[PDB]
Amino acid sequence: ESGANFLSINGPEIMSKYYGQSEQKLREIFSKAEETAPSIIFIDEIDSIAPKREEVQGEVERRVVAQLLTLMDGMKERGHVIVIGATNRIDAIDPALRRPGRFDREIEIGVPDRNGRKEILMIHTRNMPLGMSEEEKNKFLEEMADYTYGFVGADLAALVRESAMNALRRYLPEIDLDKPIPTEILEKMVVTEDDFKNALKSIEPSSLREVMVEVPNVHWDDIGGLEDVKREIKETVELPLLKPDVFKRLGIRPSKGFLLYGPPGVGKTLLAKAVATESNANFISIKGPEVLSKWVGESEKAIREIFKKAKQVAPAIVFLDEIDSIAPRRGTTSDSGVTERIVNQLLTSLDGIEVMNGVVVIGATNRPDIMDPALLRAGRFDKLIYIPPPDKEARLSILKVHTKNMPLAPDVDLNDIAQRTEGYVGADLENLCREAGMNAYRENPDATSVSQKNFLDALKTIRPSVDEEVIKFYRTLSET
Amino acid sequence: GIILRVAEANSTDPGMSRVRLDESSRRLLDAEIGDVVEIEKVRKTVGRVYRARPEDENKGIVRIDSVMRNNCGASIGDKVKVRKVRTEIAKKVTLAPIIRKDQRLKFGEGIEEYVQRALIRRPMLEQDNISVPGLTLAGQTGLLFKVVKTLPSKVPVEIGEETKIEIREEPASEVLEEVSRISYEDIGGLSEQLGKIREMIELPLKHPELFERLGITPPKGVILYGPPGTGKTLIARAVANESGANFLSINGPEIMSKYYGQSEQKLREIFSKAEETAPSIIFIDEIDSIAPKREEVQGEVERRVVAQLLTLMDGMKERGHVIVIGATNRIDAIDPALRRPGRFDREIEIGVPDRNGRKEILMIHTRNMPLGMSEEEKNKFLEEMADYTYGFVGADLAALVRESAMNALRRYLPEIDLDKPIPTEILEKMVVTEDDFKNALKSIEPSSLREVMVEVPNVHWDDIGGLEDVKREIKETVELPLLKPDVFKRLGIRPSKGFLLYGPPGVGKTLLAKAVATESNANFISIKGPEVLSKWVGESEKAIREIFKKAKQVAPAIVFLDEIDSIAPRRGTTSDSGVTERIVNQLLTSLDGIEVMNGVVVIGATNRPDIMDPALLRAGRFDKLIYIPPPDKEARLSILKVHTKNMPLAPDVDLNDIAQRTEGYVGADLENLCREAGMNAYRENPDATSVSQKNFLDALKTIRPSVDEEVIKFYRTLSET
C-alpha cells in the first residue's frame, strides 16, 4: 500500500554468509536502505540475529548484532526510513534492544478469537466454491470456528489443503487422472463440511500455545433457579460499568470480587460462565487442569503476564479455581495462610494490581478449606456467596433444561421426584440424566425403557448428597 | 472394462505368475478360473499370469504380484488389457544369468532340482525374467533369470514338471527391468500410512500438469521418523523407483568427510543437481547430523550447514517441480525452526507395527527361503512368530532370522559340507524348523528400548466367568455410543469419559477389561503401574502427553489407567482430599481438556480406591464405580471350569463340594489355587498328594479366606459420598 521499497532480511542469506561475507552484507543491505530511501526495513531474523541471552554463540553472533545496533545508530533517524523487526515469541531477543537509541515500540501480536478466526479464515475461505450469505449456516465459518481451537493461518491453510485432498480422494483420483482437464469435473467440485470435520477427528490439530483466551456460549436460558444470586451477580459485576458517575455519588471504596463454593461444577462452573455472555465481555478462566499445564511448561512466570494480559482484553472476568489446592501440601493453610512459592505471585499481584479496571475477580471450590487470612481481607477475595442445593421449584427449572433436548412424554414425571428429594445439587441433577437418560425411552434394547423408575433406580444407587454439617461448616467459616 | 487394476499382493504366491485374480473380477471379464492370461499394457510390454481366486478383495482392483508388475513396470492404477488365451506346455527351455552388479552367479548344478520343483506351471514367454527365491535367507534371495530360447517360443506356455531346463550360464545382462528397484509390495510396514505418505507426492511426480496448482499447494517438505536405516531408509530409495525420477542421496559419510569449505560448496553442488535432474526428489536422513540443534554451540560448521539448507529450499521458487523430504531417528534431534513456514511443513510420524503389521514386515523377509503361508497353515505361519516377538523392527528381524539362519547352518552346513563346490544333495537338506526362530527368542538378542508401544489382546468372553451383570453393563457404556449416535442425539444426554473398577489385583479385573477390547474389535491401550514406572524413569513422562494425542488416531481404542495415583499420596495426603503430584496433574488437566465423543474409553482400577481427587469423582473425568462382587457358587463353577478345561478331567476333582462351602473366594484366589495345587493334581510328579480332592482343600486351609465384609461396606460408604 505504501508503494515504497521493501528490504528483505532473511534466513538463507545470513546462514550462507559466514565471517566477512555477512559483515559486509550488513552494510550492503544498509547501503540500499539509503539509496532506496524512503524504504522500510523488516527483520524476521531477530531470532537468528540476536537470540543472545548473554552467552557465547561465537564471534559472528556478537558481530552481526553489534553492527545492526550501529547500523541503526549510523542513521540520523532521518533518511525517512523505519526499521522494524519480528520474532517467533516473547523470547529469543537481545535484552539491550529495549534500550534507547534503538528499537523502542514493541507491538505484541496475539492470536485470534471466534470472530478473529473468521477474519483469518475469510482470507483462505475463497480460493474455492464456498459462500457466506449463500450458505447461511452449514458452510459458514463460525461452525468451523467453534470446533477449531489453537490454530493459525498457515496451519489452517495447510489444514484445508489437507482437507482439500479429502475433496480430491472422493473425486479426482478414481475419476480423472488425465492431464487435460475435462469440463465435467468442474461442476463436480464442491466442499462438504465432512471434509473439514474429518481433519478435526484426525491427529492434525495440535496446540502448543501457552497463553490463550476464550468466550462462552452460555446464556441464562439454560440456567436454573437460585435467582437470588442471579441479581446479586448483576449487583457486583454489572453495576460499576454503567453507573460510575453514580459510583462517585455514594463514594464507596473499591473491591475485587466475590467467591463461590459448592460441589464441583454443579451450576458453579456454568453460573460464572453465563455472566460473561450477558455482559458481552470476554472470559478469562484460570483452572486447576489449566494451571497444571502452565507450571509444567515453565509458564508460571507467564502468569504474571496473564495478569497484565487482562487489562487490554478488558472488560473481562478472571476465573481462578484450585490453584490453592497445591498450597497445603508444603505447609498447612486454611485460615493459617502459608501457601507456596509460585502462589504468592497470585497473592502479591492482587495486592498491587490496579482497581477500577474492567477485571472481575472470581473464585470457587468444593469446600473452601484452603485460603489465607489475607485472602479473606479486602483488596483480595471477598464475601462468600452461598450456593444452596436446588429446591423443588429450582430443581423443576433445572430438570426442564435437561429434558428439553431429550424427547418428551408423560412417562417422565418431574413432579414426583422433586417432592421427595430436597437435597440433590446441580451436578447430581446433571449426572442423573446422563446415564439414566440413555435408559430413557428407546436408545437401546434393554428392558428399563419408558419408565419413571429408571430415574428412581439410579436414585437409590447415587448418594443423596444431603449434608447438613458441611452447610453448618460454611456458616462458621464465613463469619470467622 | 478390461482395464483391471494392479496392486500390491497381500497373499504373495512366492511362485511368480500365480497372481491372484478375484472370482468376481474374472466374471466381469468373462474369463474362467485356471487359464493362461495375457497381460498387455502401454509400451507393448507383456507378461503371462495364472488366475487364482482370493477372498477379501473386491472387483474394484486386481491384486497383482510385485515382480510381474516389475516386469511390465506397472505402477498402482495403470491401464492393462487382459483376456484368456489358448493353453500349451513347454518342451525345452534355455536360461541365462543376469549380470550387472551381481558379480557372475551360481556355478554348480541344480539346473533341474532348483528350477523344476519351483516351476509349478508358471505361464510365461520368451525373454522373461522369473523370480525364484528359496533354500536359505543368506546367500539366496529373489533372483532373476534371463530366458534365452524355448522350443514353443512367443506362444503361451506353462512349463511342466516333465520338461527339462537348461542353464547356459553364459554371462549377460537383463533384457527386462531387473532389481535395484523396490516396489511397494517389496516394501513392508504400516499399510494405510504407506498410501497416505505417497498420495501427496503421487500425482505431482508422475505428471507435472496432472496435479500442479489445482487442488492445493503441492508438498513443501516431509519429515520422517523411526529406525533410520532399518528399511525405513530403504523406503526412500524405494519411492523413487516407481516414480522413475532421480534420487538425490544426502548421507552421513559425505557430510562427515567434507569439512569447512568442502561441505559448504557441496550443499550448493547437490542443489545444483537438484535443478538439473529436476524433476527429482530430495531425501535427507541426516537431519540428526545436519540440524540436531537445540540452540547450543556445536561449532560454526553446524550452524553453517543448517543455515544453507534453509536458504537452499528458500532459493527455490518451490517450482523446479521437486519435493524435498527428510528423515530422522526419533521425534528429537531436529531443528525447532524447521516447523516455521517457508520450509518443511508436513510432518508424517512413522510408528511401529502391530501383530498384523509385523506380518507385513516379516512377509518381506519371509521369502528368501523355503517357507510358506497357505502351504504351512499354522506352524510356519508368521502370526505364531509374531505373538512371541515384541518390540522389533525389520532390520532387527532381518538380522535375527539371519542369526537364526545360522541355527539352520549349525545343524547342517559346518559338519556336513565345508566344500566350496555346492553339492546337489545339500539343497534338499535346506528347510527351516520353528525351533531355529525359538532358540533366538530364548537367547539374549531381543531388546526393546522403545518408549511408546501399543498392543491388542487375545482374550474373549469364552474364558470369562460369571458377573454377567457387569458384562451387559460394559456393553452399555462402551459399545452403545459407536453404533447408536443418531439414537444418542434422540435422547440428548450429555457426554462422559468412562467407568472405574475396584477389587483385589487382577482377580477378573485385568482380564475383564482385557476381554472387551477383542469383542469390539478395537485396539487396547494399557497404562499400568509397572508400565508407567518405565516411563518416568526414561524421561517419558512428557511423552504421556503425546500418548494422549496418540490415542485419537489409533481410535477406536480403550485407555486403561491403573495405579498411577499410587505415587500421589506420598507427597501429600490424597484420598478424597485431592492433592496428588506434579506429573500426575498432567493426567488430570488433560482429561479436563481432552475432547469427548472420540473413540477413547476411560477405564481405571485399584484394590481399594483409597487414592483419588474430588475432581476424579466429578464428571468429565473418572465416573460411577463398578462393584466387582466375589464369585458366587454359580460364578465360581463357571470360573473353575475355565481353569480345569486345560488340565485333565476326572471324577477325582469335584467342583461342587468346594463351591458350596466357600462363598468368598475372589478371582485371583481361584486363579491361584489351580496353580500350585494343580501341580499336585493328578500325576505331574511322584508326590503322594496326587489324584485327591483334599489337595485343593489342604491349600484351602493355608490360603486366607479373603472374606472381608468391612471393606465391602467401606466401598458403599465411599461410593455415595
- How determined? cryo-EM
CB contact under 8 A, B77 and A329: no
Dist CA B399 CA B589 (whole Å): 44
Chain A residues within 8 A of B496 when measuring between CB atoms: 434-435
Query: Would the CA dihedral through A437, A439, A443, A449 be positive or negative?
Result: negative
* Residue keyed to cell 481438556: B593
Chain A residues within 8 A of B207 when measuring between CB atoms: 179
Whether the Cβ atoms of residue B621 and residue A431 lie closer than 8 Å to each other: no
Nearest CA in chain A to B340: A88
Q: For the sheet containing A5-9, what is the strand order?
A: A5-9, A39-43, A82-85
Q: Give, for B500, the enclosing helix (H) or strand (E).
A: strand B498-502
Closest to B588 (Cβ–Cβ): which among A292, A431, A437?
A292
Closest to B310 (Cβ–Cβ): which among A11, A51, A435?
A11
CB contact under 8 A, A443 and B590: no
Dist CA B558 CA B599 (whole Å): 8
Summarize the annotated binding site of A for ATP as residue ranges: 262-269
A87 at B interface, C-beta within 8 A: no
The candidate with the shortest Cα–Cα distance to A62, out of A22, A33, A28, is A22
Whether the Cβ atoms of residue A378 and residue A358 lie closer than 8 Å to each other: no
Dist CA A334 CA A346 (whole Å): 16
CB contact under 8 A, B492 and A88: no
Total residue length of chain B: 721
A248 at B interface, C-beta within 8 A: no
Nearest CA in chain A to B310: A12
Task: Please name every residue paired with B146 in a beta bridge, in sequence order, or none if there are none.
Answer: B96, B129
The residue among A177, A268, A455, A470 with the most chain B CBs within 10 A of its CB, best to mutate, is A177
B484 at A interface, C-beta within 8 A: yes
Residues 6+ apart with CB under 8 A from B585: A288, A289, A292, A296
The candidate with the shortest Cα–Cα distance to A88, out of A46, A135, A57, is A46
A437 at B interface, C-beta within 8 A: yes
Instruction: Provide the residue type at A196 as one letter.
Output: F
Burial of A91 (0-12, 13-18, 19+ CB in 10 A): exposed
Closest to B491 (Cβ–Cβ): which among A60, A322, A443?
A443
Chain A residues within 8 A of B719 when measuring between CB atoms: 463
The candidate with the shortest Cα–Cα distance to B631, out of B594, B658, B649, B593, is B658
Per-residue 3-state assignment (H helix, E strand, C coil) for chain A: CCCCEEEEECHHHHHHCCCCHHHHHHHHHHHHHHHCCCEEEEECCHHHHCCCCCCCCCHHHHHHHHHHHHHHHCCCCCCCCEEEECCCCCCCCCHHHHCCCCCCCCCCCCCCCHHHHHHHHHHHHCCCCCCCCCCCCCCCHHHHHHHCCCCCHHHHHHHHHHHHHHHHHCCHHHHCCCCCCCCHHHHCCCCCHHHHHHHHHCCCCCCCCCCCCECCCCCCCCCCCCHHHHHHHHHHHHHHHHCHHHHHHHCCCCCCEEEEECCCCCCHHHHHHHHHHHCCCEEEEECHHHHCCCCCCCCCCHHHHHHHHHHHHCCEEEEEECCHHHCCCCCCCCCCCCCCCCCHHHHHHHHHCCCCCCEEEEEECCCCCCCCHHHHCCCCEEEEEECCCCCHHHHHHHHHHHHCCCCCCCCCCHHHHHHHCCCCCHHHHHHHHHHHHHCCCCCCCCCCCCCCHHHHHHHHHCCCCCCHHHHHHHHHHHHC
A186 at B interface, C-beta within 8 A: no
Dist CA B551 CA B555 (whole Å): 6
Dist CA B252 CA B650 (whole Å): 68
Residues 6+ apart with CB under 8 A from B202: none
Instruction: Provide the residue type at A329 as one letter.
Output: R
Chain B residues within 8 A of A160 when measuring between CB atoms: 216
Whether the Cβ atoms of residue B151 and residue B92 lie closer than 8 Å to each other: yes
The resolution, in angstroms to one decimal, equals 7.8
A440 at B interface, C-beta within 8 A: yes
CB contact under 8 A, B493 and A406: yes
The candidate with the shortest Cα–Cα distance to A326, out of B678, B579, B82, B344, is B579
Chain B residues within 8 A of A12 when measuring between CB atoms: 307-308, 310-315
Chain B residues within 8 A of A398 when measuring between CB atoms: none
Cα-flanking dihedrals φ and ψ of residue B188, to 5°? -150, 155
Burial of A124 (0-12, 13-18, 19+ CB in 10 A): middle
- Cis-peptide, bond into residue B423, ω within 30° of zero: no
Pairing of strands B144-150, B92-96: antiparallel
For residue A208, the distance in angstroms to the closest alpha carbon of chain B comes to 11
For residue A79, the distance in angstroms to the closest alpha carbon of chain B comes to 30
A420 at B interface, C-beta within 8 A: no
For residue B210, the distance in angstroms to the closest alpha carbon of chain A comes to 4
B586 at A interface, C-beta within 8 A: yes
Closest to A407 (Cβ–Cβ): which among B211, B345, B490?
B490
For residue B66, the distance in angstroms to the closest alpha carbon of chain A comes to 22
CB contact under 8 A, A441 and B490: yes
* DSSP letter for each residue of B336-390: GGGGSTTS--EE-------HHHHHHHHHHHHTTSS--SSSSSSTTSHHHHHHH--
Nearest CA in chain B to A198: B553
In the 8-state DSSP scheme, what is residue B535? Answer: T
The residue among A18, A52, A469 with the most chain B CBs within 10 A of its CB, best to mutate, is A18
The residue among B570, B589, B612, B625 with the most chain A CBs within 10 A of its CB, best to mutate, is B589
Dist CA A374 CA A336 (whole Å): 10
B416 at A interface, C-beta within 8 A: no
CB contact under 8 A, B618 and A264: yes
Q: What does each C-alpha distance from A289 to A319, A401, B202, B583 come to in angstroms?
A: 13, 27, 43, 12
Whether the Cβ atoms of residue B253 and residue B375 lie closer than 8 Å to each other: no
Dist CA B374 CA B393 (whole Å): 24
Dist CA A44 CA A76 (whole Å): 23
A457 at B interface, C-beta within 8 A: no
Closest to A177 (Cβ–Cβ): which among B210, B484, B491?
B210
CB contact under 8 A, A329 and B553: no
Radius of gyration of chain B (CA): 31
CB contact under 8 A, B307 and A179: no
Summarize the annotated binding site of B as residue ranges: 226-233, 503-510
Closest to B619 (Cβ–Cβ): which among A51, A172, A265?
A265
Chain B residues within 8 A of A435 when measuring between CB atoms: 493, 496, 624
Chain B residues within 8 A of A433 when measuring between CB atoms: 493-494
Cell of A406: 431429550
Instruction: Provide the residue type at B210 as one letter.
Output: L
B294 at A interface, C-beta within 8 A: no
Cell of A303: 502468569
A77 at B interface, C-beta within 8 A: no
Dist CA B93 CA B109 (whole Å): 16
For residue A235, the distance in angstroms to the closest alpha carbon of chain B comes to 30
Closest to B307 (Cβ–Cβ): which among A16, A406, A430?
A16
A29 at B interface, C-beta within 8 A: no
Instruction: Provide the residue type at A203 as one letter.
Output: I
A&B contacts, CB < 8 Å: 177
Whether the Cβ atoms of residue A201 and residue B596 lie closer than 8 Å to each other: no
| CA triple B61-B64-B68, angle to 5 deg | 140
B582 at A interface, C-beta within 8 A: yes
Dist CA B387 CA A406 (whole Å): 47
Whether the Cβ atoms of residue B401 and residue B137 lie closer than 8 Å to each other: yes
